[PDB]
Design an enzyme around this catalytic site. Structure first.
Site, PDB file in Angstrom:
ATOM      1  N   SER A  95       0.819  -1.204   0.000  1.00  0.00           N
ATOM      2  CA  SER A  95       0.000   0.000   0.000  1.00  0.00           C
ATOM      3  C   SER A  95       0.857   1.259   0.000  1.00  0.00           C
ATOM      4  CB  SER A  95      -0.914   0.005   1.218  1.00  0.00           C
ATOM      5  OG  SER A  95      -0.148   0.008   2.406  1.00  0.00           O
ATOM      6  N   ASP A 217     -12.348  -6.084   3.470  1.00  0.00           N
ATOM      7  CA  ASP A 217     -11.202  -5.502   4.153  1.00  0.00           C
ATOM      8  C   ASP A 217     -11.651  -4.290   4.955  1.00  0.00           C
ATOM      9  OD1 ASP A 217      -8.664  -5.059   5.020  1.00  0.00           O
ATOM     10  OD2 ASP A 217      -7.810  -4.609   3.050  1.00  0.00           O
ATOM     11  N   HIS A 246      -2.883  -6.266   7.667  1.00  0.00           N
ATOM     12  CA  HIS A 246      -2.160  -5.274   6.888  1.00  0.00           C
ATOM     13  C   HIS A 246      -1.061  -5.875   6.028  1.00  0.00           C
ATOM     14  CE1 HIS A 246      -0.874  -1.392   5.655  1.00  0.00           C
ATOM     15  NE2 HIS A 246       0.247  -1.382   6.354  1.00  0.00           N
TER      16      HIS A 246
END
Lengths: 269, 641, 130
Positions: A95, A217, A246
């Protein structure tokens, strides 16, 4: 060797004409790919690096003015790729590192052949007309914890605030790794992430992007995948896998790794 | 008369009595004559520095006989890299700097390091190989250890207790040169990192090849579930092949584990609790074959029953016996009326260590106290029937000699009961271990107590320790706390802190070991509603800055699934507040940002990250540790002037 | 057997015990070096060393600098290894935790290290784990 390689702890593995570049998310380092690297070295040349904010890098090299924006990270990625004569690489990023690679592809479309993104997001702060992240009200608490930690460390005391001290139960998992670097660098990188907004710039992304998300999520809303698919200027594919947390590529490899491998080896997008 | 006017011989005799390295460094800075004498008389050296600046090596230590190269930064890094032709110069540099070395300890990460450094001293007598990383793949077995066998010298002692390898490497290496095996007087194969211990056949080969052994320690495979387990025949062969043995230490690999759940039958999922292939007659024969035995340890993880007659034969056939350590030897002492029997007949024992005896009662403890009246060190582990009365009476019986006690995992002896039971020796005990068990149901000055060891479960507070009885300890200099347990099921602690500030009660406390390495949790990703290991590190390290510690060994907790023991932000921040630290060793990993916190400590000299656990971080892409980070940290640390 | 000191003081000595000194046993008894108290202490100590196992041996060294120096300097004249050991491992325990300055003060030693020499010695000492 190169100062760029030493600064970013760049390691070159495997062989082959195709190069795979693995980019960790913020708060981790290149060791987060310890389970994926074995599956790639037999047929791909793997480049692993730590971006300048990571806790494994020299904090002296961290420039607050340069790395207060994502463009600094994109330029560093471009510089690393140019240093090692890498072109048409396959970039796999976690991410907000995949977003840096996407901006880099905007700058240098040639250096990238495709993008594999693991729970990406163009903007992390939800607005009235865009639900693709967290409310500013809950990210303010994370920023306040980081600020208190930095203030404590500046006075010589112990930074004792943690992501587990948040009551969101989702910010605890998402912001877990932001407490894994020097507190001032953590504050700078977190504010860069909060102020990031790549929604205007998605139309210039022409390289194919492969988006990997998680089912229901609780951190990054699943609608981010559809938003990216609609607003990307190139071919895109969205896959939802049954993982959580994560760091699925480290905590749940028996599910995450095959998906990443399939999106690496499939070139249609 | 002035001290400097004395003849140099007796001054050298005085200088050889200076053992503390800090005091030797101080004494070297008095005068030119003192510098010369100290440099002439320094016998043991543990090289401290980085691999990069090894060519800056000091050559004043031309007389050191014990050289320790296992702690060169980066810790565990290969001293010699075979891909570099220049690595041959390191051997010559080491030989020139330290020409008089007879005892060597080196980290044998790669075969090339051994091949380049070990042959540098033909007159080498003792060698200790250390390796916690994986064994490199070679063509055959014993190839790494066959590089040791030099045909121009005589090695007398080999210590592989920390050298991870395959158990078939040792018999293969010892069988390639009979002279090398025959010249061995001590062989330490007691490695807890072996996946399985030596088989019976391997033990037979090792003992057969080395007939002149005086000391033999090995991690053997005694579990009868596996094919090739060590049994009666293995012990008989040990007795036959090595009659000159003085120290015999045999243990199962699981019996050497740091985590109690690995060897404790109570904490194992039905493992153990089955009789081992050892008989009383076999032990009688083995003891009969070993007349010169002085130290005996048989720490098994499988029950042995009716071992009393064997231990009675021990006293008659082994007059030199001073130390006995037994693991799961049942029927050790079952006295009748007033007749001593079993281990109690060995009146010459100086130290006795006992683990997991189901047959032991209070009468057995009393019989041991009355028979083993010279006992100066007692240790009992996991005996469910002995209570405070038996332990107190045995302590009163041995009140003239007992100064080293350990009471662990005993069901009916909590912290309070153990401290009450050790009342008769309260003014004489020097070393003490108790378990911090606060929930166990049912003058005061520790005058000579200098060392305390504690075992405590995860999430339990240390605060009741002072109220338990360990209140006035004017001489306590070192305390060791070990924390074990699976914290993934635990909830957040109601209390914010573990209670290290409770140790302000002891004024002389300056050295501490905090071993949290056996806490299993989540390192960087807790699933949901769970807390990661940083919360627990903060919990166990809050208040550590208030103590006046000069030395600290810290073992960070691990996430077993990911195999990482990283230091976290709260842990580094709290260790930074320890302003009086002289030595700081962390048995885990820490990245550059957190390691640089320790530069705020003004008097810090010895800092190292020592991943002396199996398996160790293999490369730079498997953990957060980096060689450049270590070099920069050490350069900056040795730069504060 | 009766002994005499350097200044002229005469002191009796128990026999057998005197064989402890290998020099004495090897060779009235005109030894000129041990001076009164020194010979008294040496003989008395070797007397105890025929039968506080070490607590008498530690109290025995409660004497001051001068007496200790005389004691060792003459125990070298009697070549008695146990006495040498027991004595020297007191002058060694007085070089325990102490700065170089403190050692120079306790033993009246004067410095002769130029600052560059001290820099060199500290750089060398940095190569050892204390």
């Amino acid at each position: 060797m190169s100062s760029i390689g030493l600064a970013h702890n760049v390691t070159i593995l495997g062989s082959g004409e195709t190069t795979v570049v693995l980019g960790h998310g913020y708060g981790t380092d290149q060791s987060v790919w310890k389970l994926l690297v074995p599956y790639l070295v037999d047929d791909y040349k793997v480049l692993l690096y730590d971006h300048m904010g990571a806790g494994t890098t020299n904090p002296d090299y961290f420039d607050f003015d340069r790395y207060s924006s994502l463009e600094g990270y994109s330029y560093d990625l471009i510089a690393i790729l140019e240093e090692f004569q890498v072109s048409k690489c396959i970039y796999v990023g976690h991410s907000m590192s995949s977003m840096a690679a996407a901006v880099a592809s905007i700058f240098r479309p040639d250096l990238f052949h495709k993008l594999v993104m693991i729970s990406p997001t163009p903007r992390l702060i939800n607005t009235e007309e865009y639900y693709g992240g967290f409310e500013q009200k809950v990210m303010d608490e994370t920023l306040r914890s980081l600020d208190e930690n930095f203030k404590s460390l500046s006075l010589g005391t112990a930074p004792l605030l943690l992501a587990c001290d948040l009551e969101s139960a989702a910010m605890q998992e998402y912001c877990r790794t932001l407490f894994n670097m020097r507190p001032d660098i953590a504050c700078c990188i977190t504010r860069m992430i909060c102020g990031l907004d790549l929604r205007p710039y998605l139309g210039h992304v022409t390289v194919p992007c492969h988006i990997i998300q998680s089912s229901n999520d609780i951190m990054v809303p699943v609608a981010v995948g559809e938003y990216l698919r609609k607003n990307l200027g190139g071919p895109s594919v969205v896959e939802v896998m049954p993982t959580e947390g994560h760091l699925p590529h480290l905590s749940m490899p028996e599910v995450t790794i095959p998906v990443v491998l399939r999106h690496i080896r499939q070139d249609i997008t | 008369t002035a001290l400097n006017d004395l003849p140099d011989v007796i001054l050298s005799n005085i200088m050889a009595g200076v053992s503390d390295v800090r005091s030797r460094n101080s004494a070297s800075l008095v005068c030119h004559k003192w510098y010369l004498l100290e440099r002439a008389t320094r016998s043991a050296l543990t090289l401290r520095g980085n691999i990069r600046d090894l060519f800056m090596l000091p050559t004043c230590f031309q007389s050191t006989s014990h050289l320790d190269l296992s702690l060169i930064s980066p810790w565990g890094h290969p001293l010699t890299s075979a891909a570099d032709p220049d690595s041959a110069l390191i051997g010559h540099l080491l030989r020139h700097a330290f020409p008089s070395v007879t005892s060597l300890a080196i980290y044998a990460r790669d075969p090339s390091t051994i091949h380049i450094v070990v042959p540098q001293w033909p007159d080498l007598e003792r060698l200790k190989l250390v390796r916690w990383h994986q064994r490199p793949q070679t063509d055959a077995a014993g190839d790494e250890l066959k590089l040791l066998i030099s045909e121009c010298g005589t090695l007398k002692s080999l210590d592989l207790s920390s050298f991870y390898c395959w158990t078939d490497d040792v018999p293969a290496a010892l069988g390639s040169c009979p002279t090398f095996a025959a010249n061995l007087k001590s062989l330490n194969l007691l490695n807890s990192s072996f996946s399985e211990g030596f088989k019976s056949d391997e033990i037979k080969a090792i003992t057969k090849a080395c007939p002149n052994l005086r000391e033999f320690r090995a991690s053997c495979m005694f579990d009868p579930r596996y094919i090739g387990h060590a049994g009666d025949e293995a012990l008989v062969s040990i007795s036959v092949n090595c009659p000159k043995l003085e120290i015999l230490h045999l243990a199962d690999t699981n019996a050497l584990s740091s985590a109690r759940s690995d060897f404790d039958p109570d904490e194992r999922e039905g493992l153990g609790q089955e009789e081992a292939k050892i008989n009383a007659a076999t032990l009688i024969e083995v003891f009969s074959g070993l007349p010169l035995l002085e130290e005996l340890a048989l720490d098994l993880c499988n029950n042995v029953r009716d071992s009393g007659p064997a231990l009675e034969v021990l006293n008659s056939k082994c007059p030199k016996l001073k130390s006995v350590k037994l693991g799961q030897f049942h029927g050790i002492s079952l006295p009748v009326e007033s007749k001593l029997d079993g281990i109690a007949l060995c009146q010459g024992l100086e130290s006795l260590s006992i683990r997991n005896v189901d047959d032991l009662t209070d009468m057995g403890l009393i019989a041991i106290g009355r028979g083993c009246y010279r006992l100066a060190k007692f240790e009992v582990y996991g005996c469910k029937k002995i209570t405070v009365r038996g332990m107190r009476t045995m302590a009163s019986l041995l009140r003239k000699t007992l100064v080293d006690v350990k009471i662990a995992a005993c069901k009916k002896l909590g912290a309070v009961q153990s401290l009450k039971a050790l009342e008769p020796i309260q003014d004489r005990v020097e070393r003490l271990h108790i378990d911090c068990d606060w929930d166990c149901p049912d003058d005061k000055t520790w005058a000579r107590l200098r060392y305390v060891s504690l075992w405590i479960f995860v999430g339990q507070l240390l605060t009741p320790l002072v109220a338990a009885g360990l209140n006035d300890c004017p001489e306590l200099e070192e305390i060791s706390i070990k924390v074990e347990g699976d914290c993934r099921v635990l909830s957040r602690p109601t209390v914010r802190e573990f209670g290290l500030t409770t140790l302000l009660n002891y004024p002389k406390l300056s050295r501490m070991h905090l071993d949290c390495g056996d806490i299993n949790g989540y390192a960087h990703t807790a699933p949901s509603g769970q807390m990661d290991l940083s919360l627990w590190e903060r919990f166990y390290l809050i208040g550590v800055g208030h103590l006046g510690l000069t030395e600290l060994n810290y073992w960070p907790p691990q996430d077993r699934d990911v195999n990482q023991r990283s230091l976290s932000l709260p842990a580094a921040g709290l260790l930074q507040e320890c302003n009086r630290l002289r030595k700081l060793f962390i048995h885990g990993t820490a990245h550059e940002h957190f390691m640089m916190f320790f530069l705020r400590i003004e008097g810090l000299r010895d800092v190292q990250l020592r991943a002396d656990y199996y398996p160790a971080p293999e490369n730079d892409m498997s953990t957060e540790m980096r060689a450049d980070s270590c070099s920069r940290f050490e350069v900056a640390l040795n730069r504060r002037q | 057997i009766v002994l005499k000191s350097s200044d002229g003081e005469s002191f009796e000595v128990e026999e057998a015990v005197a064989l402890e000194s290998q020099t004495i046993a090897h060779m009235g008894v005109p030894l000129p070096n041990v001076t009164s108290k020194i010979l008294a202490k040496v003989i008395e100590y070797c007397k105890r060393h025929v039968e506080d196992l070490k607590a008498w041996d530690a109290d025995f060294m409660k004497i001051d600098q001068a007496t200790l120096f005389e004691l060792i300097l003459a125990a070298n004249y009697l070549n008695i290894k146990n006495l040498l050991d027991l004595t020297c491992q007191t002058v060694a325990d007085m070089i325990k935790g102490k700065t170089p300055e403190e050692i120079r003060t306790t033993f009246n030693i004067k410095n002769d290290f130029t600052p560059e020499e001290e820099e060199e010695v500290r750089r060398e000492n940095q190569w050892a784990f204390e």
